[PDB]
Design a protein around this ligand. Structure first.
Ligand SMILES: Cc1[nH]c(-c2csc(N=C(N)N)n2)c2c1C(=O)CCC2
Ligand SMILES: Cc1[nH]c(-c2csc(N=C(N)N)n2)c2c1C(=O)CCC2
Ligand SMILES: [Mg+2]
Length: 103
């Protein structure tokens, strides 16, 4: 239980973060040329919230795998100096920081 209560805290804090704006909803590939071709496993915060709401996370490491996927995808598709890239570096460092001060 205490494994997933920490996930609720960190997801809530990511959802409300100023830099979370790129990651609150699935990328719409109709709007982003090449996204479906390049990103094989899309992930975003609303999909994590939904899976957390169903309890579809066995452990905290599965939750962290999805979170890291959000930022691996971001770094794969976006230049580090792009608007989305810069936001994902902020969010990734935030996640990494909060994660290790729980484990
Ligand atoms: C993870 C991610 N979120 C968004 C996004 C949300 S809202 C918005 N609106 C713009 N850019 N005007 N872009 C993108 C993205 C990518 O990885 C590729 C480019 C677009
Ligand atoms: C060029 C461009 N890409 C996006 C975008 C990518 S991904 C996403 N996420 C959704 N649709 N949930 N929006 C937008 C955009 C605009 O010009 C203004 C509207 C939003
Ligand atoms: Mg480190």
């Amino acid at each position: 239980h205490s494994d997933l209560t920490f996930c609720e805290i960190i997801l809530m804090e990511m959802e409300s973060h100023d830099a979370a704006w790129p990651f609150l909803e699935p990328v719409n590939p109709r709007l982003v040329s090449g996204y479906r071709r390049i990103i094989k496993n899309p992930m975003d915060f609303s999909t994590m919230r939904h899976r957390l709401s169903r309890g579809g996370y066995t452990s905290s490491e599965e939750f962290a795998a999805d979170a890291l996927l959000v930022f691996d995808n971001c770094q794969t598709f976006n230049e580090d100096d792009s608007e989305v890239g810069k936001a994902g570096h902020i969010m990734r460092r935030f996640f990494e920081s909060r994660w290790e001060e729980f484990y």
